[PDB]
Design a protein around this ligand. Structure first.
Ligand SMILES: Cc1nnc(=O)[nH]c1Nc1cccc(C(F)(F)F)c1
Length: 255
């Protein structure tokens, strides 16, 4: 997986990552003389601590093979350290939804939820817990294809047991997925706008939940609400979410 730096032509900055800017570029490879790629960079990669955390993402992504999870292409492990990834040419999901708010039909939004559910059912099948499911970590490969894209706490997305006890499980991922579905159906609006991170848990404990997005199907909102059961053992698994989203999608496409 090590790639010679001379094989990479760094292009334009496409966005911001947790560790530094992400660029588009070209990988001039034996298999493909002009492969379009994304290049993740890391500020302060001279710190062993930071570099270990950065490159851990690449190690993680290398373990997965799924149509809706972004693929690792390789790494450059000399300063400045870079991770070379599959390029998703339509960019981050939140930006995409906000810009295309009035060009995306409901069927596409449900499709995106469904595709993410397929990725997360796959991770569940491997007993992998993601811990940070949110629209900010999803990328758009085509107008009909989204992918999970990325391996201070995201309190507004977290399950109550995660906030209270720092416990993350497959069940907490489902809660976060519920929030991510809400985000999609809200065209990339963040949950709990105007609320302080410290006041989120009080509202959750008081039985409050994110409201039904405008134009959201009732079957779909009901599914979200099931993801947000206080007791983790009452939340569905991703196999059930995927099946229900497929039926909802098909009902929408028949409309
Ligand atoms: C990991 C990855 N793989 N393929 C990509 O095409 N982009 C990626 N990451 C990423 C992270 C943050 C922001 C943005 C951007 F450019 F805004 F979309 C992209």
């Amino acid at each position: 997986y090590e790639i010679q730096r001379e094989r990479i032509e760094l292009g334009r900055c496409i966005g911001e990552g947790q560790f530094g800017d992400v660029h588009q570029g070209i990988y001039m490879s034996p298999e493909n003389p002009a492969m379009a790629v994304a290049i993740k960079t890391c500020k302060n990669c001279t710190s062993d601590s930071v570099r270990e955390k950065f490159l851990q993402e690449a190690l993680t992504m290398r373990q997965f093979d799924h149509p809706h999870i972004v693929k690792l292409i390789g790494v450059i492990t000399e300063n400045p350290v870079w991770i070379i990834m599959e390029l998703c040419t339509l960019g981050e999901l939140r930006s995409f939804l906000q810009v295309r708010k009035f060009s995306l039909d409901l069927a596409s939004l449900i499709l995106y939820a469904y595709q993410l559910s397929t990725a997360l059912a796959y991770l569940e099948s491997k007993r992998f817990v993601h811990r940070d499911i949110a629209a900010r970590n999803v990328l758009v490969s085509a107008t009909d294809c989204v992918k999970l894209g990325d391996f201070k706490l995201p309190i507004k997305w977290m399950a109550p047991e995660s906030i209270n006890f720092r416990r993350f499980t497959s069940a907490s991922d489902v809660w976060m997925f519920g929030v991510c579905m809400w985000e999609i159906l809200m065209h990339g609006v963040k949950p709990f706008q105007g609320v302080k991170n410290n006041d989120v848990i009080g509202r959750i404990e008081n039985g409050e939940r994110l409201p039904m997005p405008p134009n959201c199907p009732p079957t779909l909102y009901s599914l979200m609400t099931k993801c947000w059961a206080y007791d983790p053992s009452r939340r569905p698994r991703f196999t059930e979410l995927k099946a229900q989203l497929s039926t909802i999608l098909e009902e929408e496409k028949l409309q």
